Amino acid sequence: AGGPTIEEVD
Amino acid sequence: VQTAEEIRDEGNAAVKDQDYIKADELYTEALQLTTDEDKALRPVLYRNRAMARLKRDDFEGAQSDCTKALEFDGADVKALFRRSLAREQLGNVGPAFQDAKEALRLSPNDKGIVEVLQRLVKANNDKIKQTTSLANKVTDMEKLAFRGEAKDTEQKMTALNNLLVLCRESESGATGVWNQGALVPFVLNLINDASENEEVTVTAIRILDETIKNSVRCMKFLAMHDPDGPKSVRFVCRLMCKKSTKDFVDATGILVQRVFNAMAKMDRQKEMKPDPEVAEANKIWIIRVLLELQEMLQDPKVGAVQRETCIDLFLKNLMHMDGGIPRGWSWKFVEERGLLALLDVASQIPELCEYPVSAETRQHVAICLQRLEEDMVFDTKRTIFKEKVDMFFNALISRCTNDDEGHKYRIKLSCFLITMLQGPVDIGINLITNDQLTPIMLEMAASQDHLMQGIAAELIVATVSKHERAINMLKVGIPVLRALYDSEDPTVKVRALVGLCKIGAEEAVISLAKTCKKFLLETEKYSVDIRRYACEGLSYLSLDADVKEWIVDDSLLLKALVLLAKKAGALCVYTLATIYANLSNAFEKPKFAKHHVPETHPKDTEEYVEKRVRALVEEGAVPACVAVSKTESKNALELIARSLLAFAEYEDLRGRIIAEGGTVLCLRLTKEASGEGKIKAGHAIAKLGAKADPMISFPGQRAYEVVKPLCDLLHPDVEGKANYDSLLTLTNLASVSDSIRGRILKEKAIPKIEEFWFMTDHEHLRAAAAELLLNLLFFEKFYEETVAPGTDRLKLWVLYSAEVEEERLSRASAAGFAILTEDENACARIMDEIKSWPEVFKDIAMHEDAETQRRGLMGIANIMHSSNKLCSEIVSSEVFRVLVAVTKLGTINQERAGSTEQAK
Numbered sequence: 001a002g003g004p005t006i007e008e009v010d
Numbered sequence: 011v012q013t014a015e016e017i018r019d020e021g022n023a024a025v026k027d028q029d030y031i032k033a034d035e036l037y038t039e040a041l042q043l044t045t046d047e048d049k050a051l052r053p054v055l056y057r058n059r060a061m062a063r064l065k066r067d068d069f070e071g072a073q074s075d076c077t078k079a080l081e082f083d084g085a086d087v088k089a090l091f092r093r094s095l096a097r098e099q100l101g102n103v104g105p106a107f108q109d110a111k112e113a114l115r116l117s118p119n120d121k122g123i124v125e126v127l128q129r130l131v132k133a134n135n136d137k138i139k140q141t142t143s144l145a146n147k148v149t150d151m152e153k154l155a156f157r158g159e160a161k162d163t164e165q166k167m168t169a170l171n172n173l174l175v176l177c178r179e180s181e182s183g184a185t186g187v188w189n190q191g192a193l194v195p196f197v198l199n200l201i202n203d204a205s206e207n208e209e210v211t212v213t214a215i216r217i218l219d220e221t222i223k224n225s226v227r228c229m230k231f232l233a234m235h236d237p238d239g240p241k242s243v244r245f246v247c248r249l250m251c252k253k254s255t256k257d258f259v260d261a262t263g264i265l266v267q268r269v270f271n272a273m274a275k276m277d278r279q280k281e282m283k284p285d286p287e288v289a290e291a292n293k294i295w296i297i298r299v300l301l302e303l304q305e306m307l308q309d310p311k312v313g314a315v316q317r318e319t320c321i322d323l324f325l326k327n328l329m330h331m332d333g334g335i336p337r338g339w340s341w342k343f344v345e346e347r348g349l350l351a352l353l354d355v356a357s358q359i360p361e362l363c364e365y366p367v368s369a370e371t372r373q374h375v376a377i378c379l380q381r382l383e384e385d386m387v388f389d390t391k392r393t394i395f396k397e398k399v400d401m402f403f404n405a406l407i408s409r410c411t412n413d414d415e416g417h418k419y420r421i422k423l424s425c426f427l428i429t430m431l432q433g434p435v436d437i438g439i440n441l442i443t444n445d446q447l448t449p450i451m452l453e454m455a456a457s458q459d460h461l462m463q464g465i466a467a468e469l470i471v472a473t474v475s476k477h478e479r480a481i482n483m484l485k486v487g488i489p490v491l492r493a494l495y496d497s498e499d500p501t502v503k504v505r506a507l508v509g510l511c512k513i514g515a516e517e518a519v520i521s522l523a524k525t526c527k528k529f530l531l532e533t534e535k536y537s538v539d540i541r542r543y544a545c546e547g548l549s550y551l552s553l554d555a556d557v558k559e560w561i562v563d564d565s566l567l568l569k570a571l572v573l574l575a576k577k578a579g580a581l582c583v584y585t586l587a588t589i590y591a592n593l594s595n596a597f598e599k600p601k602f603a604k605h606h607v608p609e610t611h612p613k614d615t616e617e618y619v620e621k622r623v624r625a626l627v628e629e630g631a632v633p634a635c636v637a638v639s640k641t642e643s644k645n646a647l648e649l650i651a652r653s654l655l656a657f658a659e660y661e662d663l664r665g666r667i668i669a670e671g672g673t674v675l676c677l678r679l680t681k682e683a684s685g686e687g688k689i690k691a692g693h694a695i696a697k698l699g700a701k702a703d704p705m706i707s708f709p710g711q712r713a714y715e716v717v718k719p720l721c722d723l724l725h726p727d728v729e730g731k732a733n734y735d736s737l738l739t740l741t742n743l744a745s746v747s748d749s750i751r752g753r754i755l756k757e758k759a760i761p762k763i764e765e766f767w768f769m770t771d772h773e774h775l776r777a778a779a780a781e782l783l784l785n786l787l788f789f790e791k792f793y794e795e796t797v798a799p800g801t802d803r804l805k806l807w808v809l810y811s812a813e814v815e816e817e818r819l820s821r822a823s824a825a826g827f828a829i830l831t832e833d834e835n836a837c838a839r840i841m842d843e844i845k846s847w848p849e850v851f852k853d854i855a856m857h858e859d860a861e862t863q864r865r866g867l868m869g870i871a872n873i874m875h876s877s878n879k880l881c882s883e884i885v886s887s888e889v890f891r892v893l894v895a896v897t898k899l900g901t902i903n904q905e906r907a908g909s910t911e912q913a914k
Contacts, residue, residue: 005122006088009022009058 014044014051018058025062028758031281033062042286053082060092068282069181070225071275072096087116091123094130101182103133144186148173152189155214156196163207170213178220188221194231201252208255215261222265225288228272231265232295243298247306250316259315263323269299270327270335278326278333279681286336296335300328300343307351310365317355317366318374322642324352325378329385340385344395352379353402356433357426361461362418369539370581373641376433383434399430399437410450417462420450424465428472439480442473448483455490464502467494471509488513500536504529504543511547523551523560531570541574542581549585552592555611562593562622568629575634580641586634587649593626595619596652596690620660627657632670639675647683651676651691658698668698668707677712680719692719697732699739704746713743713750721759727766737766737778745785755791767806773816780810780822787830797836804830804839808847811866812854820854820862827854827869828905837877848887855890860900867905874912881912 021036037059044051060075076093080086094109107130114123154160154169177187187193200206200214222228235242246269250262271277273296274289289296303320306312312320330337343349356375358367386392406426410419427447430438441447451469454462470487473480488510495506495516507529511522526548530541548571551557561567575586591597595614612618635650654676658664664672676698679691695716699707708716720736727733740763744751763786766772766779787793796803807830810823830836841847854866874881884891894906 006091006120007122009025009061010054010088 012043014040014048017043018055021062022058025058025065030062030065034059034066034068035283037062038285050082053079053086056081057086057088057092060089060096064092064096069096069099071285073100085116087113087120087123090116091126095126098126098130098133099181101180101185103130103137106130107134141186144176144183147176148186148189152192152196156199163210167207167210167213170210170217174213174217174220177217184221184224185227187217188224188227191230191234193218193221194234201249201258204253208257211253212257212261215258215265219261219264219268222268222272225272225275228268229292229295232269232272239295240298243295244302247299247302247320250319251313254313254315256315259313259319263319266299266303266323267327270296270323273299274335276327276333276335281333283333284336289336296339300324300339300348304343304348304351307355308365312366314366314368314371318368318371321352321355321371321374321378325374325381325642329381331385331387332381334385340382341391341394344382344386344398349382349395349398350402352382353399353426353430356429357406357422357424359421359425359465362421369542370579372429372432373580373643376429377643379429379433380435383437396437399434399441402426403441407446407450412453417454417459420454420462421465423447423450424454424462424469428465428469431472435475439473439475442469442480442483445483448486451483451487452490455494460499460502463494463497463499464505467491467502467506467509471505471512474509474512492516500529500540504540504547507547508543508550512550514550519551519554519557520560522547523557526551527564527567530574531566533570533573538574538577539581542578542585545571545574545578545582545589546585549589552589555613558593558622559613559618561589562626565625565629568626568631572630572634575637576630578638580638580643580646583638583641583643583646584649586638587646587653590626590631590635590653591649594623594653594656596649596656598652619656623657623660624663627663627667632657632667632672636671636675639678642682644684644687647679648685648687648690651679651683651687651689651694654679655690655694655697658694661701664698664702668702672698673707673712673716677715677719688719689723692723693732693735696720696723696736696739699742700735701738702742704742708743713747714753716743717750717753717757721754721757724759724762727762733766734775734778737763737775737782741778741782741785744782744788748789751786751789752791754786760786760792773819777818777822780819780826784822784826787826793830793833797830797833797839800839804836805844808840808844808850808854808869811862811869812850812857814854814857814859814862817859820857820859821865824854824862824865824869828865828872829869831869831872832876834876837873837880840873841880841883848883848885851887852890855887856893856902856906860902863894863900864902864905867902867909871905871909871912874909 017040018037021033021040024030024033024036037055041052041055041059044055046052056075056079060072060079063069063075064072073093073096076089076096079089080093083089090109090113094106094113097103097109098106107127110123110126110130114120114127117123151169151172154166155173160166160169173187176183178184197214197218200211203211222231232246233239233242235245247266249265250259253259273292274284276282276284276289303323306320307317307324326333328334328340328343330340334340343352352375355367355371356379358364358371360367360369360371383395386395403423403426406419406423410416410423427438427442430441432438451466455466457463467490470484470491473484473487491506491510494502495510497503497506507522507525510517511526526544529536529544530548533541536544548561552561571586571589575582578586609615632654635653639647639650641647654667654672657667658672673695676691676694680688680695682688683691696719699716699720704713716739720739723731724733724736740754744754763779763782766775767783769776769779772779787796807823807826810819811827812820814820844850851866851870854862854870856863857866874883891906891909894900894903
């Protein structure tokens with residue numbers, strides 16, 4: 001659910 | 011223009027698309043845009059590239075980008091995570107904890123940070139306990155291999171391979187064989203020993219080869235040989251000279267190679283385009299290195315082999331526009347001594363060399379100048395470049411006076427052009443046009459001096475090509491060849507047979523054939539370099555059906571055309587490739603009126619190609635390929651590629667073409683061969699693996715490698731290719747041996763093999779489409795991946811099993827039904843989420859497939875033998891069950907009498 005599971009950049 | 015900002019988003023998006031190769035590049039490239047006045051805008055990036063890098067196994071990088079980000083903020087849990095994640099991978103669990111640990115308490119909860127720490131914990135435990143276990147494993151052989159103490163070759167040798175096996179087997183074991191440099195002096199000693207067997211030495215270099223694939227370790231190796239940096243850089247390069255056998259030199263170069271890879275954080279075999287910052291950082295070392303490999307481009311003391319090397323070494327790591335150093339190096343290389351001096355070679359030969367050279371030394375300087383050309387891009391540049399090759403052609407030419415000595419110069423300016431033509435052809439052809447060259451051409455062409463006589467008949471043979479504007483100097487030149495041809499001096503006769511062979515519409519197409527024939531055929535007498543042309547000639551006479559048939563028609567011309575390659579090596583590639591590639595029709599052409607009558611030539615169309623390919627692969631044809639195959643050509647590869655691809659489409663053939671280094675080559679091709687090269691070579695791989703046993707074709711990890719290709723060749727599934735030939739391969743691959751399927755899986759290749767299933771009018775491509783998966787889920791990873799989840803899988807391993815209006819598609823999803831059944835959670839996802847389940851179970855129940863009524867009765871019997879809410883269900887299907895209960899042949903009563911069993 002989502003991606004903030006630091007498997008995402010920013 | 012472009013903004014620091016947005017560009018990142020471009021990569022951010024890439025990261026999400028799954029193009030980490032891109033992401034990596036995009037971020038890095040993006041990073042360049044910003045600077046040190048846009049603070050925060052950067053850290054963010056290091057963090058993110060590190061993300062992708064970590065994704066592409068650029069651990070040493072991931073880590074460095076990670077820490078490069080913490081540099082700004084201590085927190086940055088994002089970073090500390092990735093880092094420890096990377097670090098633990100470099101085999102270094104130590105601070106791997108202190109990052110992951112510290113991370114955890116910064117993001118209190120985080121199934122991730124936790125998941126790692128659980129690992130790292132069991133890790134620091136089996137750390138000291140386990141390292142000093144290897145250290146001993148090591149120091150025990152460090153005795154056998156190096157430190158005297160070992161008896162008889164055989165063992166000392168074995169003891170090495172181990173260190174090597176153990177060296178690259180794990181990021182850890184490497185640091186272990188490195189033994190903190192202890193390795194260096196031990197290897198160097200084998201190098202310096204004059205007697206030490208080559209293999210020994212080579213093997214010992216290859217251990218070191220690996221050890222230094224680590225930027226830090228490598229970058230240590232470079233500086234570690236003399237307090238004075240520059241001096242050390244010399245030593246390293248100049249290692250390739252200590253000895254001088256083919257292999258010793260080769261195995262050595264890689265060491266030098268590593269130095270580049272390390273220096274600018276780039277690796278051509280990984281597609282790791284250099285990090286602009288790293289190179290730029292330790293730039294000073296990149297200077298000293300080139301400088302050295304360059305200065306030895308001429309030292310007459312520097313051998314030939316070693317010479318040829320410093321050229322490729324130069325090629326592969328300087329051309330920024332191609333897997334090379336960053337942009338700008340290639341420029342200052344032509345803007346100074348580099349180019350000129352790289353040309354000074356282009357005008358040398360084995361019969362007049364101011365510094366050791368070999369017959370082969372040309373190719374290496376052709377393509378290498380060709381790329382230095384390409385790797386220029388800018389007009390401001392291309393200029394400063396030609397405004398140099400030219401500044402050369404002048405000085406060289408205005409010194410070609412007619413006199414015993416001056417004549418030397420004409421041979422120079424001549425060869426200098428035979429190369430410049432094969433290489434950056436444009437700057438070359440755009441050179442023979444200033445006919446100030448054509449007179450000298452004649453002068454020598456007519457003199458008495460057999461050399462000038464021949465290399466003039468070759469300065470034209472090498473100007474044939476296509477277009478005109480150059481058919482100016484050719485006008486007079488072709489006839490000249492006709493005259494020179496008469497010559498009794500074989501050397502000048504042959505060198506004239508070409509060109510006069512390389513034109514067409516004494517010179518009859520057949521004539522020129524019978525020429526290169528006995529010219530070649532005459533093994534014992536005529537020399538090798540003589541037949542290097544006799545091969546090149548015949549080669550041009552192979553683009554016409556008629557001839558093609560004639561050639562192969564005579565054994566002795568194959569037995570010998572082979573024998574030649576098995577000696578001329580990469581001197582008959584471009585050529586013997588086009589001979590082997592043209593007689594197999596491995597060349598592909600784009601696809602009131604007529605012109606269908608000419609498309610005939612039965613020697614070309616129809617299985618008349620097979621006639622040739624047959625008795626051809628009979629006469630070596632393969633051993634010959636592996637022979638002249640070592641050549642960073644590009645097209646030559648692509649040539650031997652199709653020459654193989656089109657060799658493995660006849661069945662009983664690949665039966666031996668496999669025992670003749672087959673698998674090895676086209677496999678090497680995968681990496682080395684360019685463009686269609688890999689592509690067409692891989693098809694050869696896949697189209698060889700099928701009705702072939704993987705034990706006698708892909709052993710020794712040969713397998714593991716044969717995956718990245720035919721799992722990337724599948725990607726092209728919008729249609730075409732031998733995707734199918736690639737299935738009977740992964741099918742005969744994922745079959746016996748787990749590890750295999752491991753890669754197949756890690757390949758992120760299932761989303762595609764999972765569609766040879768979703769097909770209608772493709773019966774065949776689906777036959778194995780499944781037979782594969784049976785040997786894929788055949789052992790966890792993908793077994794628990796297909797059951798639990800909740801992604802409509804099981805729904806088909808059952809339908810296909812019953813849906814047998816054909817067969818196979820059953821037998822596959824059948825033993826893929828029986829073995830997927832023994833799992834309980836399986837019997838779950840079905841019954842409740844499988845409407846009209848009985849109707850299906852009914853057909854498959856005894857479905858006339860004298861097999862599926864056994865794999866069905868088993869994948870059905872065990873659905874009830876486990877779980878009773880299913881053991882119940884006797885509505886309609888429980889009937890047929892009783893069925894088999896007499897002497898009705900088909901032993902399918904087996905899993906039949908088992909269905910009843912689940913009644914107790």
